[PDB]
Design a binder for this molecule. Structure first.
Ligand SMILES: CC(C)CCC[C@@H](C)CCC[C@@H](C)CCC[C@@H](C)CCO[C@H]1OC[C@@H](O)[C@@H](O)[C@H]1O
Ligand SMILES: CC(C)CCC[C@@H](C)CCC[C@@H](C)CCC[C@@H](C)CCO[C@H]1OC[C@@H](O)[C@@H](O)[C@H]1O
Ligand SMILES: CC(C)CCC[C@@H](C)CCC[C@@H](C)CCC[C@@H](C)CCO[C@H]1OC[C@@H](O)[C@@H](O)[C@H]1O
Ligand SMILES: *C/C=C(C)/C=C/C=C(C)/C=C/C1=C(C)CCCC1(C)C
Ligand SMILES: *C/C=C(C)/C=C/C=C(C)/C=C/C1=C(C)CCCC1(C)C
Ligand SMILES: *C/C=C(C)/C=C/C=C(C)/C=C/C1=C(C)CCCC1(C)C
Lengths: 222, 222, 222
């Protein structure tokens, strides 16, 4: 509790943990191979998130980066979380609409670039350059959003759940580059405790909130 | 030869190397696509292991971690080995029984969490926390063991080889958290040379020993 | 522009960037699922390369390694590029000839070992050992070349484009271990600026040059 942001990291940890356990119990019994796929993907997401929230809470996922003539606290563990979780979440949307492998690779490759360049931006020591990396990560984000709207016989429950989950994704994901820009990785207008609060609300909605909508749907069943 | 554990790292290196070459020569000629799969997976495992044993032997895969008021030698390269090899080994079991993709992802995701949290525990500088990570890695291990027994028309040679390899896995894998807890990553009761000896016997049995049983079986052929 | 090699890193960055945009525009409209696969793979390659060239140009992808009694500049970001791009390129060849999954895994696993051991060699602080890692990476390279010639009903356009792209691969890839050995990672005969020039010509040919030949071919269409 030395750092003011501990509370939001604690709550993130708890909520990802409880979400994972909920999904895990909910997907017991599931015999449908397609349903198993969606549960496996959607439960793994908050499982990984739990581990990386814990790491930040305990101090392990935090590093100091010198820039602006300061030693800046950067939580590097978010990118380790997002490196795996954001593609799994895109895979959830991809499988729902029976995407072509070529489209799956494009989403996943663009997403790896999004998070990888975002990470490089987070750890870059020349201040002006950090925003060069932010711009590149955002171009990759915009690509991903474009494919979700314009890149994809489909059952009506699948169509309907996809349109909901796609709208949840556009709104929530588009917010991340904004928090990063105004927070302590970027311009440093909003302090880290508030930034951490913003990412915890964003992540819990994008993982547990997303997963509740998906796993309650008939779309996950063949 | 400055460090007493060099011998076991040398022998591990030799034995993984010779195993890889044996499997490589054994899988020449193989035309059956299913058989190719099992050889590719089972030969890659000791190939990666060879590289990471060499790295520890040469000094590259070793790092000092400060905890307990000591500078502790931690061989970080084991987790780089296991990050890739333990899933490949689970993939061997998964393909043998024609597992659903949802089950394959669950095993592989749980295994990534097992090794990733194990790594974080290995490098953590607050002593009490290291065992928080050990506990979490063990929960993920227990999950994996559960799926192998309760998560899975099957040919009798496949059934029979699976039950052998599953029993080899349960016995050998369950030993790793024990060695780690009592060794120099954990409570520091057993010294590092003996710990290194325990992991070399464990790894060689779990990779080369496992691979001998699998690759001698008729189960690998469609 | 403090370091003489900046020019080649700038030009590499520009050329990978323009290549990516060219491929991206060229693969708009593509409805054929097989064609989408090849574009997704072949566009992702210079996309990742662009990011890692930029990182070297900006200073981020550079590190000092002490060996020979010097502080040696090693561009570590090449291996982060190649870790993902060389397998994707092998996947391009693999899918062209309808390779068995067992062969795909062997190529990809051998390639991961090639680049991983190459990375360990690049960062190793005992000079003589660096070349132990170089030897091991080269054995893995030779394995890969062997499979491409001896490891693989096939349409004649596919046969023909494969033989072209395979010859482009053998010639270009075999050059990398040579540049590394005589450059600043190895014996230090050729200085870093010239070495950087050699890798930029090699990478642009192997990614954009390769991709031009592949994406202009009828082989990519089912
Ligand atoms: C010991 C304490 C510190 C408690 C913390 C442990 C917990 C919060 C985090 C551990 C998560 C991880 C080890 C378990 C997640 C397993 C996922 C791979 C579950 C995927 O499950 C689906 O895939 C199989 C499908 O058939 C479907 O039924 C799902 O259950
Ligand atoms: C130069 C010395 C230092 C000797 C050390 C080299 C050696 C011990 C380690 C190198 C291992 C690696 C480069 C070769 C392993 C290749 C695997 C991918 C083999 C997979 O093989 C199967 O997959 C193809 C299948 O069709 C089946 O036939 C198998 O052979
Ligand atoms: C803002 C500036 C700094 C400009 C730099 C951005 C640019 C050079 C690098 C960004 C690359 C990345 C974000 C976009 C690459 C997307 C690939 C995944 C494209 C794969 O495209 C294929 O896959 C889908 C298929 O259907 C086929 O049509 C292809 O288009
Ligand atoms: C569960 C976590 C999720 C869904 C995280 C999503 C994160 C992003 C869409 C982040 C995007 C960013 C950019 C577009 C610019 C650079 C900074 C990032 C990584 C925050
Ligand atoms: C070839 C290597 C194998 C089969 C290694 C298996 C390793 C494990 C099952 C390790 C498990 C661990 C825990 C359950 C707790 C934390 C420490 C570990 C990683 C040793
Ligand atoms: C786009 C980049 C490509 C096609 C890079 C290919 C790189 C190699 C084939 C590198 C091979 C090396 C060895 C065989 C020995 C050790 C050093 C390396 C990694 C340069």
């Amino acid at each position: 509790t030395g750092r003011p942001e501990w509370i939001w990291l604690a709550l993130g940890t708890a909520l990802m943990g409880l979400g994972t356990l909920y999904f895990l119990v909910k997907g017991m019994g599931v015999s449908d191979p397609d349903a198993k796929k969606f549960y496996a993907i959607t439960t793994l997401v908050p499982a990984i998130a739990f581990t990386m929230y814990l790491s930040m809470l305990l101090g392990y996922g935090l590093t100091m980066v010198p820039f602006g003539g300061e030693q800046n606290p950067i939580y590097w563990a978010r990118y380790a979380d997002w490196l795996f979780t954001t593609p799994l979440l895109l895979l959830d949307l991809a499988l729902l609409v029976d995407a072509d492998q070529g489209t799956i690779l494009a989403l996943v490759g663009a997403d790896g670039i999004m998070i990888g360049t975002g990470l490089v931006g987070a750890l870059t020591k020349v201040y002006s350059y950090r925003f060069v990396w932010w711009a590149i990560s955002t171009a990759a984000m915009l690509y991903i959003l474009y494919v979700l709207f314009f890149g994809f016989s489909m059952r009506p429950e699948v169509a309907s759940t996809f349109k909901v989950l796609r709208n949840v994704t556009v709104v929530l994901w588009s917010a991340y580059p904004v928090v990063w820009l105004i927070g302590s990785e970027g311009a440093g207008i909003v302090p880290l405790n508030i930034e951490t609060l913003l990412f915890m609300v964003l992540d819990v909605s994008a993982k547990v909130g997303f997963g509740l909508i998906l796993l309650r749907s008939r779309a996950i069943f063949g």
